[PDB]
């Protein structure tokens, strides 16, 4: 089997992407944030504290296929400080036509303020490795992990759009969705992430520096977070750019034409256009824009978030020894 689903930016900044997910019988369609940086499928629900709901909710008592996983609870927090917790059902979950029975659907009893505040996101679908799942006492498998037995190939692909719709595919590689060939690179699962080592970087039309950058492919992070020295090298090529303590990162004049940023995948090179790094104005009509490449020093890990991923066709190969592929597009 295969699935194919359209993913859409939630706003004009490409802050995040939502993808429809059908849960239960009859199907309840929720728009979830597919997150390769975590491993819980959790949803706003009829269980969620009413004052914390503003979203489409899952109602387990309206699904004939929902089963309570007795004694199971979950609790998660994320790098940006957001969090949620609750209890657990198994139910039928379909993404893009691909159906999994017995998927753990984590029903939120409570959600943090940032989730309440984002009317567009009805929950998360985690796509990192199942060792990160927060269900206790027994961790639950991701949608991808459960799907592998039926998939035509144990892969999914992320094709995120630049201010445009894109696609998540499960079980096949669409050879018309990218140019050139895919270059694959080793993944470490020791921390539960799609963790890999980039072979280096270049700024604009400058030289490629061979330097190992260990980081994660994270569709649930907006920006590209890289080592401080790498980020400083980038913004040195932007004449108005400065680090802003109050804004919390590099800012630059919105009118500037930015250089591209290239990262290495083995011998291959992925080029992030300058325009993608022009993230947006600090407020509507501001002359100051926030940069799309920022230091990873605060987060503590390098993160190839959407600014990087949307420049590529990205293959999450979930064979027993996983690998990560990138192609230009």
């Amino acid at each position: 089997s295969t699935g194919s689903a359209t993913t859409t930016p939630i706003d004009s900044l490409d802050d995040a992407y939502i993808t429809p997910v059908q849960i239960g019988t009859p199907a309840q369609t929720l728009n979830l944030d597919f997150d390769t940086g975590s491993s819980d499928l959790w949803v706003f629900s009829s269980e969620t504290t009413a004052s914390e709901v503003x979203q489409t909710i899952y109602t387990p008592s309206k699904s004939t296929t929902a089963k309570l996983l007795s004694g199971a609870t979950w609790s998660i927090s994320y790098g940006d400080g957001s969090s949620s917790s609750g209890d657990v059902y198994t139910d039928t979950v379909s993404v893009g036509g691909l159906t999994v029975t017995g998927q753990a659907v984590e029903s939120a009893k409570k959600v943090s303020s940032s989730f309440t505040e984002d009317s567009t996101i009805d929950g998360l679908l985690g796509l990192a490795f199942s060792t990160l799942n927060t269900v206790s006492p027994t961790q639950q498998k991701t949608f991808f992990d459960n799907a592998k037995a039926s998939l035509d190939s144990p892969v999914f692909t992320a094709d995120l759009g630049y201010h445009a719709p894109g696609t998540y595919n499960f079980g096949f590689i669409d050879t018309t969705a990218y140019t050139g060939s895919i270059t694959y690179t080793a993944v470490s699962t020791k921390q539960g992430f799609w963790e890999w080592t980039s072979t280096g970087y270049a700024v604009g039309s400058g030289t490629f520096k061979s330097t190992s950058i260990d980081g994660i492919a994270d569709t649930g992070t907006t920006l590209l977070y890289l080592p401080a020295t790498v980020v400083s090298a980038y913004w040195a090529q932007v004449s108005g750019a400065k680090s802003s303590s109050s804004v919390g990162g590099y800012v630059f004049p919105c009118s500037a034409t930015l250089p591209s940023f290239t990262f290495g995948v083995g011998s291959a090179r992925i080029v992030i256009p300058g325009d993608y790094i022009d993230f947006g104005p600090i407020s509507t009509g501001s002359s100051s824009c926030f940069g799309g490449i920022q230091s990873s020093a605060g987060i503590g890990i390098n993160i190839f978030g959407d600014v990087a991923l949307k420049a590529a066709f990205v293959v999450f190969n979930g064979a027993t020894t996983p690998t990560l592929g990138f192609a230009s597009k």
């Binding site: 706003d11 802050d15 995040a16 944030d33 927090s77 994320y78 990192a128 920006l223 987060i299």
Partner: peptide
């Protein structure tokens, strides 16, 4: 309004 998805 950037997002940073597990801690």
């Amino acid at each position: 309004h950037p997002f940073a998805x597990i801690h």
